[PDB]
Design a binder for this molecule. Structure first.
Ligand SMILES: NC(=O)c1ccc[n+]([C@@H]2O[C@H](COP(=O)([O-])OP(=O)(O)OC[C@H]3O[C@@H](n4cnc5c(N)ncnc54)[C@H](O)[C@@H]3O)[C@@H](O)[C@H]2O)c1
Ligand SMILES: NC(=O)c1ccc[n+]([C@@H]2O[C@H](COP(=O)([O-])OP(=O)(O)OC[C@H]3O[C@@H](n4cnc5c(N)ncnc54)[C@H](O)[C@@H]3O)[C@@H](O)[C@H]2O)c1
Ligand SMILES: O=c1ccn([C@@H]2O[C@H](COP(=O)(O)OP(=O)(O)O)[C@@H](O)[C@H]2O)c(=O)[nH]1
Ligand SMILES: O=c1ccn([C@@H]2O[C@H](COP(=O)(O)OP(=O)(O)O)[C@@H](O)[C@H]2O)c(=O)[nH]1
Ligand code: NA
Ligand code: NA
Ligand code: NA
Ligand code: NA
Ligand code: NA
Ligand code: NA
Ligand code: NA
Ligand code: NA
Lengths: 338, 338
């Protein structure tokens, strides 16, 4: 298929592009480079085994999106582009609403204009809001996300749903990601956050690499087995694979196809820390800190639906997530070259 | 004060501009004319007793908004501009999200750029969603609006709330309108819908004027006194006045000030029909039809808060709403001149 992968040079998108190319699809990457570098492009091609076309540009530029769509006879679009720092979204709400809400709106508007009707959207577990019922199931009604970031995701899901109702021939997949971690097994592609990493894994990796002192564990008094927060970590390669399958199996299948993408099990901060120490050969330094504002104690995905409907399920383990992350971090301590 | 009134040439905005000018404020009207005509401008000035400046343009044009803001040293913005046909929003969701969600986002982004921090937003009762608890109170948590239109309003309220949190010096009023009806007492300014009117009052007026055959009453089996739908009708002049007061009393008062703007009492479709027949001197023709998709049986506003906090309450009656509407309709059967 001919697929436009917005945000394709970023963390999840890069790994997805590799898998797509390996499945022999024709890949057009669209990215504005606000959170990634052109240096990953060659890695993508080398690992994917085929050349993906790259276009530097912004999802907010509807005219350009329209042109790309038509120019490359795209059949389906995989929407990863956007801003995702939670804390920052609280501080700079407008930029989140613009890049995520308007960003998507301009993109799907461009699609309408070019007669493209197959879409995959990067959504998140945050859409569930404060849900006491875990694991989270697609059938659950959504709640109220606590941050501008979370809200922007849910708003897009709603807009996409209304669009589909209005243009019933569209196929739209709402992929709710849990906690993406890991890196390509080669160790030459992985997450390359700039500055202080907001997520657990990359932070741990930086402590392990010798860049940071200690991992601050946000809260140790939660109603969990070990008192630390529990989440559903999912390896980026498994996420990538789920994206190829969703794209191939849902194209031209009208509807709004919602799927949680997670392993279906929970792991605590300590469990993650422990796996990492194991992977890197030395105890990871850490300390307990107060609970992070807005955090839930525990949640994980109910991934039965994707298993059933798409025959997709995770295959990488927590140890692999940790080992792959350390391999990339250690092989490329400065991330992607400038 | 120096106020930019977006959508100022439309129904509610036109009447608001008149009241503003009567209070001697300097008024800049911004409208794209998609649902109003330049012909109302002179009426505004004549009834307002002062000249308002008019700029033809779109809220989506952030550069222009920014320029207007700075150029006119605006102190406060009253945001009426947007699309509001419910049924149509279901059919053309994107246009609603664009004009309302993006439209507002571009406008407040322009404000940020120009250092403007006083805003009034035209919100609606739809934000309450399916609320069994009536009357509706500002303290109630919001629900899930059933149409793209309703959703777009709630999304804006959320964006505005996050913005205020991020920029705590801002004063933002969320004015939730109930069922605006009526016309300026002169009979020379009023609602001028194009095509089939979606709201009850204008439809009734058109039946009364001899343009339409019969009023279709959507449903006669509701759990209400007379079986027809019950709402809180509020005269446009009262709404207008509430806007002047909100603007004058909340400017430079940091916070998100939410107020329901309604009369605080309910009236049925039949009650409205009856008042109109009374006003126009002849029985209004009507028939019973099936319930309109998504309609609630009954709802009205709890307007205590605005009374208490702003010392504002309605002063026009249902009969006046009907008489003023008929006077305008009858004096100007073709609406505003082309
Ligand atoms: N990483 C996670 O834990 C997590 C969890 C759920 C959802 N998501 C979502 O998945 C998607 C991908 O996440 P990621 O981890 O790969 O992040 P990422 O930052 O690595 O990738 C996003 C990419 O989008 C690009 N981009 C940002 N705004 C753009 C715009 N306006 N126009 C064009 N390009 C733009 C960035 O340059 C970057 O390459 C995002 O939508 C994110 O919100 C991620
Ligand atoms: N009339 C009601 O019953 C009702 C109830 C609640 C909320 N509202 C809201 O109150 C506001 C005013 O409603 P109204 O009855 O006066 O409607 P209206 O159509 O008469 O006024 C809206 C005005 O905005 C202008 N406009 C539309 N999109 C624009 C854009 N992108 N850029 C610039 N101008 C644009 C139109 O030309 C029109 O003059 C709207 O936001 C509406 O959703 C109205
Ligand atoms: O420096 C960090 C980052 C994360 N966490 C915890 O690790 C889990 C995952 O946090 P993350 O930000 O990666 O993702 P989230 O679950 O919030 O989407 C949660 O229980 C966080 O409290 C932590 O203790 N320290
Ligand atoms: O042609 C019409 C228009 C409206 N209504 C009813 O009148 C009330 C007000 O409808 P409207 O569309 O004006 O406003 P809403 O309350 O839906 O915001 C509701 O009970 C509608 O069902 C009706 O019976 N016929
Ligand atoms: Na096509
Ligand atoms: Na339709
Ligand atoms: Na960063
Ligand atoms: Na680097
Ligand atoms: Na100012
Ligand atoms: Na802040
Ligand atoms: Na119309
Ligand atoms: Na006319």
């Amino acid at each position: 298929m001919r697929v436009l992968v917005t945000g394709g040079s970023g963390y999840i998108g890069s790994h997805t592009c590799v898998q797509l190319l390996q499945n022999g699809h024709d890949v057009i990457i669209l990215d504005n480079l606000c959170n990634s570098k052109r240096s990953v492009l060659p890695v993508i091609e080398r690992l994917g085994g085929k050349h993906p076309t790259f276009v530097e540009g912004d999802i907010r530029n509807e005219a350009l999106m329209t042109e790309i769509l038509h120019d490359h006879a795209i059949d389906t679009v995989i929407h990863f582009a956007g801003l995702k720092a939670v804390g920052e979204s609280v501080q700079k709400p407008l930029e989140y609403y613009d890049n995520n809400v308007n960003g998507t709106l301009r993109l799907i508007s461009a699609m309408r204009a070019a007669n493209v009707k197959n879409f995959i959207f990067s959504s998140a577990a945050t859409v569930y809001g404060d849900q006491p019922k875990i694991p989270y199931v697609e059938s659950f009604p959504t709640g109220t996300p606590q941050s501008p970031y979370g809200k922007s995701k849910l708003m897009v899901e709603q807009i996409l749903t209304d669009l589909q109702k209005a243009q019933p021939d569209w196929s739209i997949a709402l992929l709710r990601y849990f906690n993406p971690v890991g890196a390509h097994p080669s160790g030459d592609m992985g997450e390359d956050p700039q500055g202080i990493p907001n997520n657990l894994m990359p932070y741990i990796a930086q402590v392990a690499v010798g860049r940071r002192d200690s991992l601050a564990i946000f809260g140790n008094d939660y109603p969990t087995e070990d008192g630390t927060g529990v989440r559903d970590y999912i390896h980026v390669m498994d996420l990538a694979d789920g994206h190829v399958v969703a794209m191939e199996k849902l194209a031209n299948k009208p509807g709004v196809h919602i799927y949680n993408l997670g392993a279906g099990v929970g792991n605590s901060v300590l469990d993650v820390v422990n796996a990492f120490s194991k992977a890197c050969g030395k105890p990871v330094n850490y300390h307990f800190a107060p609970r992070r504002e807005g955090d839930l104690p525990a949640y994980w995905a109910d991934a039965s639906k994707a298993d059933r409907e798409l025959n997709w399920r995770v295959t990488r383990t927590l140890d692999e997530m940790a080992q792959d992350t350390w391999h990339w971090q250690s092989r490329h301590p400065q991330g992607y070259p400038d």
